C-alpha cells in the first residue's frame, strides 16, 4: 500500500478506541441510588435524570475528577 | 613545511586574499616545484574509517 493508506488506519484505530473509553465512562445502566456514596447528599432528581445510574452528587464528582486530573 | 605555514599565514593577512604558490615561489627562495612538492608531502592521511 502506501503511507496515507496505513496512516488512515492508524488514525482510525486511534479515534475509535478514543471514542470508546470516553463512551464507556458514560453510565447506561439503571439503579437509582439517591445518596452520594461519599457524602450521603441526596442526588437531585434532574442530575439523576441525565445520567441514570449515577452514584455521586455533582460536588463529590467534581472533587473526585479534580483528584483524578493529577493521577493520584 | 614550518617556513611554508608561517609565510602562508603572513601573506594571507598582508597580500589581501591568500598566497598563491607561484607567489610563495618568490616570497621564499625556492624553485616553485619544491613548494608544490612540500605542500603535497606535508598533508596527513585521511582515516579510511571517516564516515561520509
Amino acid at each position: 500500500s502506501d503511507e496515507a493508506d496505513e496512516a488512515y488506519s492508524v488514525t482510525e484505530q486511534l479515534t475509535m478506541t478514543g471514542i470508546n473509553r470516553i463512551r464507556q465512562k458514560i453510565n447506561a445502566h439503571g439503579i437509582p441510588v439517591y445518596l452520594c456514596e461519599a457524602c450521603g447528599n441526596p442526588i437531585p432528581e434532574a442530575r439523576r435524570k441525565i445520567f441514570p445510574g449515577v452514584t455521586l452528587c455533582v460536588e463529590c464528582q467534581a472533587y473526585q475528577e479534580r483528584q483524578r486530573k493529577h493521577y493520584a | 613545511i614550518n617556513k611554508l605555514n608561517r609565510i602562508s599565514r603572513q601573506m594571507l593577512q598582508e597580500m589581501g586574499r591568500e598566497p598563491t604558490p607561484e607567489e610563495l615561489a618568490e616570497r621564499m627562495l625556492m624553485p616553485e616545484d619544491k613548494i608544490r612538492k612540500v605542500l603535497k608531502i606535508a598533508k596527513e592521511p585521511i582515516s579510511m574509517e571517516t564516515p561520509i
Binding site: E59, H70, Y71 | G16
Partner: protein
C-alpha cells in the same frame, strides 16, 4: 489591469474579499540576512552588535584599549556566475577600522596619549544573492531557519511515566540564554526539590533560606493563614465560609446557636451561602480539629524564654496546653486542604536538613563543587554570582519577555539577572500548577519556540570566532610590546573566517537548494527545520515536536511536511507568517472592534493569540464589517467554539493563511484527506520542468505570486516599452516619468539560457513580451523554468478518464496514450556535467591528446585534434568525450601473449587510456565545454580557442550593452534638443557625437544636457574599465586541487521522453507509475472522436479520500469546454461581438464572486489576444478553502455544452463498443515527478571490487551489486534454497577465486561452481588471530 494579466485573465471563483495582499514570499531569508549585514548605528543586531559585544577590548588594566570604530563590506572578487563557474564561495571582504590607544601608567585614569589607527581584515562573509541563496563552493546553498527552544521559564509534567502509581510530578525549569539552569522537581511524595545545574537534587526551601528567608516568612509567603483562638472554651476558630468549599466537617457547623451543617457532612455550596449570607465570623469546633494542624511561626516562653513550639510544628494537645499557660490566643496554623491548597512547602520544610542561611550556602557549595573546604563569604560569593551576575548569568531580553509573560507580569522587560521576586514567583506558579489552577506547558507550543534564521545564526558563529580572536588579542596586549604594534599584526583573520565558513559550508542548516522547480526553491527557502546544532535531534525528539499544536494556526503549515523519517520536524512556514521582533512567529489578524471588522491588521504572536477571541476567516459580513450571524465561529483558547457578536477580538486576514505556499496551489484542498494533501504538496515540490510549460486549467491564483516572488521569472524593474526583444535579452526603453533625472539609461535584462540546476534539470528563461509591447513595473518579462506568463506551470493538463481499462493501471499505475509522447508535453531536458581531470601520477603527467591506443579512427570522428569533443556533436554511450591517457610503466606481459605479439609485430604501448566516455545509457548533445588549466601548465589548442571565444564574446556583450545605453542617452538628449534648441530634423544628420556640445539656452535644459554628456563620458570610461577587468579575469590562471594539471568539463544535454516507469502525479497526492504507453487508436474515445489522454484507476479515489481530483477533473472539463467554445468561435471567426459576449458570460457566472471583469473597457484587438489565450482552455482560480462549490461547477459545465453530471460515455478504442456505466473524463493537471526510471534502472554482471572487503563496488553511480541483506538470507533459508544462498554469499560477492572460476565456467558452457571460502570469513580469522586468540579450522 496589468498588461501581463489582460493577456490571459484567470476566471476567479472564491468569494471572500482579500484584505491583506500576499507578502513577499522570500521575506524571511532576505530580511534576516540584510539585518545581519548592515551599517545600523545601534546594537540592534548584525555585525556591529557583534563588535560592540567584544569592543573595546582592554588590556588587563594595561592602559591600552583596542576600540572599534566601524567596519565595511568589501567588494566581491567574483560575481555569482563566475563564482559558480570557478567553484568559489561568493562573498565579500570585511574591513574593520580598529584603533589602538595607549595610556602610559601614570595618570589620570589612563591618559590617552599614544594612539594609532588601521583597517584590519577579519575574514570574508558569504553573501545572500537576490533570491536568498548563497554560493558556497559554486553550489547553490540555502540556510534553512531553525526552530529552537527560547530561554525562559517552562513548566512540564512528566505525566505518569516514572512513578509506579502514575502520579505526575510537575517540574519547572528555568533556562537562561547564558549561565546556569535551575530546575524545580516535585517527588512522588509531593516534595519540592530545587536542583541547580543538572547535578544532585536538593530540598526546595534550602534555596529560599539562601535567599535570606527563614521559616516563618516562608510559610507566610507560600500559604494562607488560619487563626484559632482559645475562646475560653476549647480553642474555637476564625472562619470565612468560602475556604471550606470542599470540606468534610468533623463537627457540627453551627452559628447563631443554629446548626448550619450536621457533623460528617461534606461541606456544600448550599451551606456556603448559608454561612456567608448569615455571615458566620467565628466558629467553634472540637479540639481534635486543631489536633493535627501545623503552627505558622515561632512561639517562645514569657516564663524562661523557652520555645512554646517551633515554627512549622505539627500540633498536639500539649502544644495548645503550653499555649494556654503562655496566655496565647492566636494559634497561627495554615490552611492546608488535600484538594486545592495542599501542603507541599510545609513537608519540604520538614525534610530541609539546614535551618539558616549559612547552612543553606554550605549545602549549596557542597553540591556545586564538592571536596574543597567551604567558607561563609566564599559560599556567599558563589551563590550570589550563580544567578545574580550581570557578568555570568543572563536571560536575554527575549528570555525576560518569556519570563515576565509566563508568570503574568504586567511589565514585559527587566533585568538579565534573577531575583527573589522571580524565584518565588516561579515556586508559586509551580505549586499552583500542582494545586490545579494552571496548566503545564506544551513543548511544541509555538509560543515557546523561537526562530533563528540565516542572519541570526551567522552572527552567533561570528561571535564565536570573535571571542577567540579577542582572547588572543587580550593576551597579546597584556604583553607590553610597545606602541609600535599596529592592530593588524596582532589580530588574526583565521579563527573568525574559519568558524563562519564552516557554518555556511557544512552544517545541517546549510543544504543544497532543491531547485528542480520554482516552487521547490521557494518552499525550501521558507522552511522551518527543527534540527541542527542548537536544536533537538531525531532520537531525542521524538513526539514532543513531531506533531501539530492548536497554535500552529497561521504560523506553520499543518499539512506540508516531508513524510517519512522526519515528519513534523521540518514544518514549513505558512503564507502570511512573519517573525516577531524577538524571533517568535506571528500572523496577521483584522482588528474587529465592537461589532465592525476594521481593515487595519494586527500581527499577533503565539503567546498572545491564546488570550483573544479570534474570528473565523469564513465569517460573513454585511458590507460594513458586522457579522450577519449572532453567534460566530471563533477560537478563544485552543478549543474552537461559538461566540456571540460582541466578543470577537480579531478576525483572520484571509482563508489561505493556514497553509504554506506549496499547499496553496492545490485547488479543492478542502476536499482532500489531510495526509493526501501532505503527499500532494511534497510531490508537487519535485515536479520536473517540461519542454512547453503549460498552465493550470484549475489553479488557485497563488501561481502568479509564487512564480514572481521566486527568482526565475525576469520581472520588470521599471515601466516602459520593449525596444528590442530577443531570445536572450530584453531591452526596455523606460518611460520618462519613471526615469532618473540625469543618467537616463534603459533597462537591459540578459536572460539565463540553458544551464543546469542543482538537480540537473535545465533552468532557462524565455521572453514572453513582444517588440513594441508596453510593460509596467512589476510585470513579467521572461518565464523561467516551469512558468507560463508569470504562472507556475509544473505539469500539463491532460484529458484523463477514470476507469480501470484492462489491469494496465492495476494498483496505482497510469495508462498514458501515445499522443502524450508524440506531443512532447513531458519531454524534459536534463543538462549533465561530466568531468575529466589530468592528474600527476608518480609515473608522470597525463595527457589529453586526441591519439589514444587501442581504438580505431571511427570512434574518433567526434574528438577534435586537441582531444576534447566538438561542441554540438551528438554523442551516446561509450563514445569518448575527452581523450586522456596515463603512462603504464611497465607491463611485464605474459607467456603466449608474448608469442602473439611477436607473430604480429605489435608493441604494447607505454601508455594506457583513461579517457572520459559518456556513462552508459546517456544520449545527448554536447552543449558546452570549459577547460580549466593549472597556472604552471600551458594551454592546449582548445583552451586558447575557448579563450578567444570568451574574449570576443565579452567584448561583443559589453559593446552591445554600451551601444544600447548610448542609444538611449542619445535619444533622450535629442528629445531635449527638440524643444529649446530647435533643429527639428536639422539635427538628425549632423554628428550625433556632436550633441554633447550643441546649442541650447543655459536653462535647466542646459544643465540637463551637461549632466547627460557627463553620463555619456561616464558610460565610456566605465564600460572600458569593466572590459579590461573582464578580459583579465578570462585570461587569468585558474586555481586547482593540488596535483591536478587541467580539468575538462562537458555538458551533455540529454532529452528525456516519458516512458513506462516514470512517476507522475496529480496535485492531490495521487502518484502512479506509467505502465504502458499504448497507441492512439487503442485509447478510449468519446462519441465525438477525441480520445482520453491518460486513463487513471477509479479505485484509488474512495480508499484514499481525495475527492479533490474528481472535482478538479469536473472543473477542468468545464474550463476546457469554455475554451473549446471560444476556439470554435475564434476559428470560424465570427467577430469581436459574439466573442466578447460569450467571454463576458463565462466571466460572470457565479455566486457573489470577487472577480468582476468586464470586456467593456478592452480594445477590440485587446479582446482578440485575450480570447486567443483562452482558446486552449480558460483558466479558473479556486482559493484553497474558498473554492468553487459544485453548483458553480455544474453552471460552468452547462456554459459549454458538456453534460452537467461531469460524465461522458466513452467508446472502446479497440472494439468500438461503448463502455456502459458512463465514465468521468476531464482535464487533470499531471505533474511528472523526477523519479525518472532511467536513473532507477541499473544492472551489474561484474565490475570493480572494494579494496579491503573484496566485494562489488561500482561507485560509478552505480555498478554496485544489490545489497543482498540479511532478511533476504532468511527468505532463502525458509526455502531449501541452500545452493542459491551459497553462491549468493561466496561466488557472487566475496570469494576471489570462486568468482573468476565462475566467470570462466559460465563462458565455457559449464554451470558448476568451486565454492571456496568467503573473503569476509578469512579476514575475520586473521583479525581474531590478531588478538591473542588462536582460531584455526580443524579437519
Amino acid at each position: 489591469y496589468s498588461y501581463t494579466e489582460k493577456k490571459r485573465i484567470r476566471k476567479d471563483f472564491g468569494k471572500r474579499p482579500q484584505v491583506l495582499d500576499v507578502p513577499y514570499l522570500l521575506s524571511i531569508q532576505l530580511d534576516s540576512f540584510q539585518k545581519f549585514i548592515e551599517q545600523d548605528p545601534e546594537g540592534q543586531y548584525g555585525l556591529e552588535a557583534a563588535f560592540r559585544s567584544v569592543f573595546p577590548i582592554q588590556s588587563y588594566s594595561g592602559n591600552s584599549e583596542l576600540q572599534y570604530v566601524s567596519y565595511r563590506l568589501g567588494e566581491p572578487v567574483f560575481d555569482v556566475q563566475e563564482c559558480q563557474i570557478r567553484g568559489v564561495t561568493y562573498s565579500a571582504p570585511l574591513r574593520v577600522k580598529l584603533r589602538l590607544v595607549i595610556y602610559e601608567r601614570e595618570a589620570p585614569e589612563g591618559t590617552v596619549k599614544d594612539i594609532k589607527e588601521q583597517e584590519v581584515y577579519m575574514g570574508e562573509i558569504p553573501l545572500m544573492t537576490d533570491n536568498g541563496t548563497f554560493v558556497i563552493n559554486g553550489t547553490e546553498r540555502v540556510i534553512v531557519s531553525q526552530l529552537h527552544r527560547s530561554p525562559g521559564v517552562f513548566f512540564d509534567s512528566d505525566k505518569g511515566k516514572t512513578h509506579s502509581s502514575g502520579k505526575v510530578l510537575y517540574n519547572a525549569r528555568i533556562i537562561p540564554y547564558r549561565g546556569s539552569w535551575l530546575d524545580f522537581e516535585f517527588d512522588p511524595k509531593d516534595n519540592l526539590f530545587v536542583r541547580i545545574d543538572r547535578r544532585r537534587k536538593l530540598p526546595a526551601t534550602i534555596i529560599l533560606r539562601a535567599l535570606n528567608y527563614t521559616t516563618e516568612q516562608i510559610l507566610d509567603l507560600f500559604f494562607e493563614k488560619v487563626i484559632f483562638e482559645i475562646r475560653d472554651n476549647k480553642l474555637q476558630m476564625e472562619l470565612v465560609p468560602e475556604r471550606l468549599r470542599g470540606e468534610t466537617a468533623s463537627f457540627d457547623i453551627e452559628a447563631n446557636g443554629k446548626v448550619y451543617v450536621e457533623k460528617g457532612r461534606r461541606i456544600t455550596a448550599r451551606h456556603i451561602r448559608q454561612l456567608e449570607k448569615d455571615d458566620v465570623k467565628l466558629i467553634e469546633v472540637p479540639v481534635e480539629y486543631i489536633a493535627g494542624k501545623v503552627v505558622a511561626k515561632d512561639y517562645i516562653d514569657e516564663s524562661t524564654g523557652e520555645l512554646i513550639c517551633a515554627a512549622n510544628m505539627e500540633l498536639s494537645l500539649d502544644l495548645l496546653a503550653k499555649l494556654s499557660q503562655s496566655g496565647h490566643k492566636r494559634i497561627e496554623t495554615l490552611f492546608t486542604n488535600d484538594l486545592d491548597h495542599g501542603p507541599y512547602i510545609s513537608e519540604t520544610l520538614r525534610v530541609d536538613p539546614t535551618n539558616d542561611r549559612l547552612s543553606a550556602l554550605v549545602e549549596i557549595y557542597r553540591m556545586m563543587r564538592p571536596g574543597e573546604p567551604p567558607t561563609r563569604e566564599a559560599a556567599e560569593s558563589l551563590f550570589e554570582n550563580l544567578f545574580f551576575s550581570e557578568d555570568r548569568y543572563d536571560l536575554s531580553a527575549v528570555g525576560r519577555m518569556k519570563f515576565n509573560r509566563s508568570l503574568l507580569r504586567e511589565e514585559i522587560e527587566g533585568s538579565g539577572i534573577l531575583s527573589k521576586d522571580d524565584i518565588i514567583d516561579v515556586m508559586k506558579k509551580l505549586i499552583d500548577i500542582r494545586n490545579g489552577k494552571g496548566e503545564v506547558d506544551d513543548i511544541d507550543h509555538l509560543g515557546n519556540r523561537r526562530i533563528r534564521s540565516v542572519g541570526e545564526m551567522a552572527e552567533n558563529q561570528f561571535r564565536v570566532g570573535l571571542v577567540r580572536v579577542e582572547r588572543a588579542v587580550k593576551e597579546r596586549l597584556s604583553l607590553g610590546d610597545l606602541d609600535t604594534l599596529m592592530p593588524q599584526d596582532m589580530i588574526n583573520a583565521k579563527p573568525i573566517s574559519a568558524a563562519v565558513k564552516e557554518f555556511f559550508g557544512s552544517s545541517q542548516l546549510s543544504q543544497f537548494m532543491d531547485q528542480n522547480n520554482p516552487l521547490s526553491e521557494i518552499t525550501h527557502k521558507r522552511r522551518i527545520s527543527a534540527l541542527g546544532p542548537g536544536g533537538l535531534t531525531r532520537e531525542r525528539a521524538g513526539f514532543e515536536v513531531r506533531d501539530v499544536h492548536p497554535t500552529h494556526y497561521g504560523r506553520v503549515c499543518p499539512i506540508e511536511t516531508p513524510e517519512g523519517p522526519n515528519i513534523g520536524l521540518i514544518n514549513s512556514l505558512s503564507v502570511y507568517a512573519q517573525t516577531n521582533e524577538y524571533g517568535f512567529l506571528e500572523t496577521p489578524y483584522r482588528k474587529v472592534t465592537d461589532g465592525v471588522v476594521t481593515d487595519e491588521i494586527h500581527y499577533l504572536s503565539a503567546i498572545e493569540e491564546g488570550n483573544y477571541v479570534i474570528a473565523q476567516a469564513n465569517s460573513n459580513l454585511d458590507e460594513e464589517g458586522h457579522f450577519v450571524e449572532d453567534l460566530v465561529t471563533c477560537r478563544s483558547k485552543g478549543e474552537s467554539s461559538l461566540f456571540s457578536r460582541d466578543q470577537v477580538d480579531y478576525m483572520d486576514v484571509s482563508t489561505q493563511q493556514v497553509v504554506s505556499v506549496g499547499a496553496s496551489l492545490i485547488p479543492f484542498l478542502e476536499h482532500d484527506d489531510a495526509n493526501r494533501a501532505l503527499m500532494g504538496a511534497n510531490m508537487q515540490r519535485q515536479a520536473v520542468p517540461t519542454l512547453r510549460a503549460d498552465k493550470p486549467l484549475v489553479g488557485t491564483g497563488m501561481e502568479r505570486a509564487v512564480a514572481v516572488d521566486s527568482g526565475v521569472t525576469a520581472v520588470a524593474k521599471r515601466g516602459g516599452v520593449v525596444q528590442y526583444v530577443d531570445a536572450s535579452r530584453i531591452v526596455i526603453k523606460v518611460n520618462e516619468d519613471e526615469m532618473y533625472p540625469g543618467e537616463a539609461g534603459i533597462d537591459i535584462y540578459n536572460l539565463t539560457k540553458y544551464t543546469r540546476s542543482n538537480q540537473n534539470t535545465c533552468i532557462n528563461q524565455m521572453p514572453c513580451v513582444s517588440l513594441g509591447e508596453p510593460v509596467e513595473r512589476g510585470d513579467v518579462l521572461a518565464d523561467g523554468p516551469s512558468t507560463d506568463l508569470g504562472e507556475l506551470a509544473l505539469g500539463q493538463n491532460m484529458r484523463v478518464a477514470f476507469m480501470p481499462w484492462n489491469g494496465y493501471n492495476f494498483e496505482d499505475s497510469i495508462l498514458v496514450s501515445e499522443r502524450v509522447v508524440q506531443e512532447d508535453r513531458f519531454t524534459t531536458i536534463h543538462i549533465q556535467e561530466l568531468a575529466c581531470v589530468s592528474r600527476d601520477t608518480k609515473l608522470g603527467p597525463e595527457e589529453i591528446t586526441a591519439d589514444i591506443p587501442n581504438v580505431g579512427e571511427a570512434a574518433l570522428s567526434k574528438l577534435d585534434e586537441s582531444g576534447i569533443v566538438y561542441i554540438g556533436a551528438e554523442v551516446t554511450g561509450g563514445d569518448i568525450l575527452v581523450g586522456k591517457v596515463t603512462p603504464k610503466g611497465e607491463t611485464q606481459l605474459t607467456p603466449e601473449e608474448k608469442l602473439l605479439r611477436a607473430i604480429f609485430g605489435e608493441k604494447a604501448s607505454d601508455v594506457k587510456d583513461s579517457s572520459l566516455r559518456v556513462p552508459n545509457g546517456v544520449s545527448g548533445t554536447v552543449i558546452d565545454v570549459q577547460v580549466f588549466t593549472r597556472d604552471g601548465v600551458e594551454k592546449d589548442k582548445r583552451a586558447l580557442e575557448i579563450e578567444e571565444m570568451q574574449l570576443k564574446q565579452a567584448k561583443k556583450d559589453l559593446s552591445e550593452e554600451l551601444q544600447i545605453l548610448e542609444a538611449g542617452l542619445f535619444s533622450r538628449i535629442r528629445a531635449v534638443l527638440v524643444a529649446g534648441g530647435v533643429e527639428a530634423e536639422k539635427l538628425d544628420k549632423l554628428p550625433r557625437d556632436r550633441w554633447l556640445e550643441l546649442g541650447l539656452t543655459d536653462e535647466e535644459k542646459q544643465n540637463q544636457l551637461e549632466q547627460l554628456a557627463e553620463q555619456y563620458d561616464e558610460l565610456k570610461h566605465e564600460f572600458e574599465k569593466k572590459l579590461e577587468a573582464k578580459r583579465r579575469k578570462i585570461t587569468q590562471g585558474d586555481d586547482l586541487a593540488p596535483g591536478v594539471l587541467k580539468i575538462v568539463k562537458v555538458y551533455l544535454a540529454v532529452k528525456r521522453r516519458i516512458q513506462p516507469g516514470d512517476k507522475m502525479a496529480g496535485r492531490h497526492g495521487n502518484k502512479g507509475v506509467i505502465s504502458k504507453i499504448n497507441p492512439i487508436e487503442d485509447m478510449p474515445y468519446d462519441e465525438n472522436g477525441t480520445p482520453v489522454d491518460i486513463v487513471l484507476n477509479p479505485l484509488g479515489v474512495p480508499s484514499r479520500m481525495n475527492i479533490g481530483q474528481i472535482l478538479e477533473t469536473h472543473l477542468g472539463m468545464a474550463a476546457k469546454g469554455i475554451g473549446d467554445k471560444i476556439n470554435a468561435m475564434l476559428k470560424q471567426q465570427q467577430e469581436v461581438a459574439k466573442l466578447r459576449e460569450f467571454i463576458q458570460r463565462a466571466y460572470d457566472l457565479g455566486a457573489d464572486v470577487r472577480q468582476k471583469v468586464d470586456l467593456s473597457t478592452f480594445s477590440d484587438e485587446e479582446v482578440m489576444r485575450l480570447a486567443e489565450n483562452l482558446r486552449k482552455g480558460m483558466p479558473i482560480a479556486t482559493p484553497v478553502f474558498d473554492g468553487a462549490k459544485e453548483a458553480e461547477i455544474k453552471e460552468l459545465l452547462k456554459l459549454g455544452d458538456l453534460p452537467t453530471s461531469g460524465q461522458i460515455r466513452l467508446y472502446d478504442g479497440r472494439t468500438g463498443e461503448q463502455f456502459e456505466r458512463p465514465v468521468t473524463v476531464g482535464y487533470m493537471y499531471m505533474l511528472k515527478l523526477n523519479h525518472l526510471v532511467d536513473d532507477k534502472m541499473h544492472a551489474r554482471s561484474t565490475g570493480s571490487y572494494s579494496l579491503v572487503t573484496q566485494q562489488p563496488l561500482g561507485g560509478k553511480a552505480q555498478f554496485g551489486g544489490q545489497r543482498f541483506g540479511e532478511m533476504e538470507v532468511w527468505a532463502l533459508e525458509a526455502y531449501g534454497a541452500a545452493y542459491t544462498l551459497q553462491e549468493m554469499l561466496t561466488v557472487k560477492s566475496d570469494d576471489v577465486n570462486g568468482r573468476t572460476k565462475m566467470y570462466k565456467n559460465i563462458v565455457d558452457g559449464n554451470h558448476q561452481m568451486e565454492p571456496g571460502m568467503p573473503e569476509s570469513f578469512n579476514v575475520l580469522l586473521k583479525e581474531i588471530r590478531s588478538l591473542g586468540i588462536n582460531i584455526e579450522l580443524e579437519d
